[PDB]
């Protein structure tokens, strides 16, 4: 029951209207009014001449309007390109061009770059917004690109991978690991343009669940432990720095939520350690790449080279071996398949570099080629 983006934000803002879907210091949104004031701003947009397809880059502060206007952008059917507002505008030239970017909606119009793109104030278009929801939106498929995100190429320059609506639509699937639902409660503190913020933005807004909202800039713990607390956070993602720090300054506060999923690069064992030791809390691994659009699996850490874990929902993760067969002990590579797998890169010839079709199950499935070395059941990198 895979459906565009906007389709199954309808879905759950019509089934949830009065549950709470994001907060800001003292500003409280219920699902109703996320979906009033993202049908507005996307007529608003309309008016603005962006049409299907149009690239659209983000500029905006973690504010209600950042998540506004990514729900608007995809109703209208155009592509996001999130861009991390920390970083010196020499490097946001560098992003859009990688990406296409024909227009970019900032917050501070006055620090923007120069380039063939259209710069459109977040501030005004938001004013704009005046009583009027109906509009004529597109029919949008499941494999509709829905926005562009950058890794690093092999130089080390920005590299746009292309991110379809089911890449992201997918986080609305309860994760059976998580036992998550509508009742629980997501911060949103990784940066936009990083795959990690599809976590904490649609697990929870796909799901009927909150999202509660971290003040811009870079982090101050204090601030955010004193927000999982006051908000109740029950699901809290962290990358390796955010999660080992907390660990050595604060671990109590990992264990106010339900569950802790710790995203990134692998993460020393010994830290895992000490965390589950201190508290209830059910702490996992998390595996994920901005190829498979989001977080991708998960391993749960019982007590005390961490495994990769389950997959999540329509994931599908294999150790080839060079029969291209499932590895027996047998050494081999990590390959991913699914709702997950990105449209690919900027033009097919790099994308015949990772992304390749390997028979497996009764069935042709598109793979991402991780380059990472794997083994057994479960998965270690
Ligand atoms: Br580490
Ligand atoms: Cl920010
Ligand atoms: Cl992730």
Request: contains cysteine.
């Amino acid at each position: 029951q895979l459906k565009a983006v906007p389709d199954i934000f309808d879905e759950i803002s019509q089934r949830f209207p009065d549950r709470v879907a994001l907060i800001f210091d003292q500003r409280k949104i219920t699902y109703r009014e996320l979906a009033e004031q993202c049908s507005a701003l996307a007529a608003v947009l309309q008016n603005n001449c962006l049409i299907k397809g149009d690239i659209v880059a983000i500029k905006i502060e973690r504010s209600p309007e950042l998540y506004i206007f990514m729900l608007a952008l995809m109703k209208i059917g155009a592509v996001m390109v999130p861009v991390n507002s920390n970083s010196p505008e020499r490097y946001i030239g560098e992003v859009l061009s990688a990406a296409g970017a024909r227009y970019l909606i900032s917050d501070d119009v006055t620090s923007v770059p120069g380039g063939a793109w259209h710069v459109l104030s977040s501030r005004t278009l938001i004013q704009n917004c005046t009583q009027q929801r109906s509009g004529n939106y597109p029919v949008l498929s499941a494999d509709d690109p829905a926005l562009i995100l950058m890794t690093s190429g092999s130089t080390g320059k920005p590299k746009s991978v292309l991110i379809a609506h089911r890449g992201i639509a997918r986080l609305g699937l309860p994760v059976p690991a998580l036992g998550n639902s509508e009742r629980d409660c997501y911060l949103q503190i990784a940066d936009i343009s990083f795959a990690a913020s599809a976590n904490e933005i649609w697990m929870a807004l796909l799901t009927g669940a909150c999202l509660t909202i971290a003040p811009p800039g870079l982090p101050d713990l204090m601030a955010l432990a004193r927000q999982i607390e006051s908000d109740n956070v029950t699901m809290l993602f962290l990358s390796g720095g955010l999660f080992r720090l907390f660990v050595e300054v604060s671990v109590e506060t990992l264990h106010i939520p339900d569950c802790v999923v710790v995203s990134g690069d692998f993460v020393n064992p010994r830290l895992f350690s000490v965390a589950v030791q201190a508290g209830k809390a059910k702490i996992f691994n998390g595996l994920g790449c901005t190829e498979n659009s989001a977080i991708s699996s998960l391993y749960h850490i019982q007590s005390a080279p961490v495994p990769v874990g389950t997959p999540l929902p329509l994931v599908e993760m294999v150790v080839f071996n060079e029969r291209l067969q499932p590895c027996t002990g047998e050494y081999g590579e990590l390959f991913i398949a699914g709702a997950g797998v990105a449209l690919g890169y900027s033009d097919p010839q790099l994308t015949a570099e990772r992304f390749i079709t390997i028979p497996y199950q009764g069935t042709d499935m598109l793979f991402y080629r991780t380059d990472d070395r794997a083994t057994y059941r479960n998965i270690v990198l």
